[PDB]
């Protein structure tokens, strides 16, 4: 065979030649043998692509190896390799490129890898949270397509328990002002974040958030590898757990595994139904392989269960599965490993774990809040509403049994007439509803800051303006839209409301 590879330096080329020669010595082709070749990247792209096309396709190469140079250009190595490989629908192997935009087998019709991109390690999040009594995550994600994929994967890998994350708020990639997201995040009972995004934005959010003291006691943070890197291990408050992979930028092992897989696939494919030959020359032929999908399909079906990196098991989307990761604690700016990821199992090490704050416990991302803001609409017979006078309280009125009327302020609107803006004047609502309100408030021992709603309706279900997307407006709507928990008022139990919500047992009959 005449396999081809695109490398960064000559030691890499020598290593590749040694690996393919060792593969031949262990097991080799009958007559075609295993010839090999490696070239070097050029910082011209267009000319590097011209070079790889001409030379490699003229070389009758059967597999193409591409490795990410350690230089962080991020669109240097795999950007022209997979495209022109797919022009002839010939598969490529990934060595040290670990983004997830390539995992989508749509445009890069040919792409493999042995470095599970950063969407994979989102699986580690559930692989751990399976048994931790951790049930409230408001994780932040950037607008990068990597972050997009990691997000969607995390939502879809959590529905097996039918649970749901609270906030999945998101932000533009690599910005320098993220304080907002944070002070709305802190005004939530939830106290866990699984933010995982670009390193620069990670440092930005750390710097802007530590000012808000949310890094203090009982507020954990969850972050993966690439988000603690270069400019991020600095601003990190203690306790930030790190999630990293076992075999890092060691090219040799991955070159070995890739060439072993390619050699095994070609040797088994030497016997097959029909094997055609690559078109000769980058120019000329304008037609695809007659058998390229055969080579690719047998390449996914590759159980190469022997290697330096163990079993290089590949998943369905042309990537690598069955990887080993690491949970590592950040102990006083001195990072040391704190967990292991052998896959579907966790074996925490015998160490003194540390969180932010400084307690040595299981900080609760959950809370009782005990605020319970209340809303209610004024009909008439169950709530009497009176504009309180300029006296700081409602009034004092009495009853027959010597029991005066309870009265509390009610921060309702003042826009009953359409067009007038809601002055939100603090009127005084009272009566039957306030009576049940105060009794139940004493029952549960909390506080209320009651206020009405602007529109003044029960808020049925309807459609948004000129669209088939449905919604709930009005009072029920402000219940759903996390604006208050209790809306106690005369509201009818019906079907469409109860089909997707839960009601207390009724307190009346009508």
């Amino acid at each position, epitope marked *: 065979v005449n396999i081809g590879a695109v490398l960064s330096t000559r030691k890499h080329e020598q290593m590749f030649r040694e690996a393919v020669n060792q593969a031949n010595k262990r097991h080799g082709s009958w007559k075609i043998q295993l010839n090999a070749t490696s070239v070097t990247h050029k910082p011209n792209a267009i000319q590097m692509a011209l070079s790889v096309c001409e030379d490699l396709i003229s070389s009758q190469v059967y597999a193409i190896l591409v490795s990410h140079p350690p230089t962080p250009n991020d669109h240097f190595t795999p950007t022209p390799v997979s495209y022109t490989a797919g022009f002839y629908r010939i598969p490529v192997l990934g060595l040290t490129t670990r983004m997830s935009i390539y995992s989508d087998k749509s445009i890069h019709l040919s792409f493999l890898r042995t470095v599970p991109p950063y969407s994979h390690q989102s699986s580690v999040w559930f692989e751990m949270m399976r048994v931790y009594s951790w049930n409230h995550i408001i994780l932040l994600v950037s607008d990068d397509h990597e972050g997009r994929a990691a997000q969607k994967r995390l939502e879809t890998l959590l529905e097996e328990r039918e649970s749901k994350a609270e906030k999945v708020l998101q932000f533009d990639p690599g910005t320098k002002n993220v304080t907002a997201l944070l002070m709305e995040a802190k005004e939530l009972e939830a106290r866990v974040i699984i933010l995982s995004a670009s390193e620069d934005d990670a440092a930005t959010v750390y710097r802007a958030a*530590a000012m808000l003291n949310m890094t203090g006691s009982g507020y954990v943070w969850l972050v993966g590898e690439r988000e603690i890197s270069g400019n991020a291990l600095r*601003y990190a408050p203690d306790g930030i757990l790190g999630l990293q992979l076992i075999n890092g930028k060691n090219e040799s092992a991955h070159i070995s595994d890739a060439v072993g897989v390619v050699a095994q696939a070609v040797h088994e494919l030497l016997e097959k139904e029909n094997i055609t030959d690559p078109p000769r020359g980058c120019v000329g032929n304008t037609n695809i392989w007659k058998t390229g999908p055969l080579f690719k399909r047998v390449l996914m079906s590759s159980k190469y269960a022997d290697g330096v990196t163990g079993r290089v098991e590949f998943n369905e989307d042309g990537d690598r599965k069955f990887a080993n990761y690491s949970i590592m604690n950040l*102990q*006083n*700016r*001195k*990072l040391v490993q704190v967990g292991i990821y052998n896959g579907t199992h966790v074996i925490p090490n015998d160490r003194k774990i*540390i969180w932010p704050g*400084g307690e040595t416990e299981k900080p609760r991302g959950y809370q009782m809040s005990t605020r319970l803001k209340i809303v209610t609409i004024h009909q008439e017979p169950f709530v009497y509403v009176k504009p309180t006078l300029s006296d700081g309280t409602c009034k004092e009125e009495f009853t027959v049994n010597g029991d005066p009327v309870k009265k509390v302020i009610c921060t309702g609107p003042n826009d009953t007439s359409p067009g007038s803006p809601r002055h939100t004047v603090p009127q005084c609502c009272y009566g039957f509803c306030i009576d049940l309100l105060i009794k139940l408030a004493r029952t549960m021992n909390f506080t209320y800051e009651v206020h009405l709603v602007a529109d003044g309706k029960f808020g049925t279900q309807e459609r948004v303006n000129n669209s088939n997307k449905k919604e709930w407006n009005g009072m029920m709507g402000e219940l759903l839209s996390g604006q208050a928990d209790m809306i106690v008022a005369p509201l009818t139990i019906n079907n469409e409301r109860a089909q997707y919500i839960e009601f207390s047992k009724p307190f009346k009959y009508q």
Partner: antibody
Amino acid sequence: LQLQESGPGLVKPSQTLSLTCTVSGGSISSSNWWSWVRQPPGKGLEWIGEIYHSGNTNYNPSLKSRVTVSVDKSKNQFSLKLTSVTAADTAVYYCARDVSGGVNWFDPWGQGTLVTV
Amino acid sequence: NFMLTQPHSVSESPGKTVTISCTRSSGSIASNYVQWYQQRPGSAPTTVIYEDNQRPSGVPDRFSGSIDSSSNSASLTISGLKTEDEADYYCQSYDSSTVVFGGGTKLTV
């Protein structure tokens, strides 16, 4: 809040020296660590390691299989168990407090002894 | 890891502005910062500037740190040279592996 390394000058070779460091004005039950950076004589410095009051510790990778440090709250003091002491210990030992903070850094150093084997 | 470089010393009269520059051998001085100690001869070390941005309580405005990160020279300034400043000046930094210290800097006034 003042440190003091107990062992003044015990420099017995081929043995297990035990320099014990205690503090006044406070106790170890806090969120901070401890430091025993070593100064070669007439030369620069040489970090040894650092310990935590409750569970863990960490040292310079230059010296791993030889340093074992413990801490006791009852005596409010912490000491090492260095094994097979050699002539390399001809260098002054210190005991400085540190602050976790945002940057690893020692609070002003201790009195320092003159332990040189 | 990575060592530093302060050759041995420097000598100048009061009224000048001269101080050694701590240099990071491997990598750049941008992630894990630098910090200068003052250690009077025959005595224990004590801080003089922290992260080369602010000075500890009691340290005069005479000392001030600055960062270039291009030559990786962690610059220190003792502008306002006088006599009492005779001590050792030790640059220190740190990483997930180790904390490392300078060779020392004792000036002649």
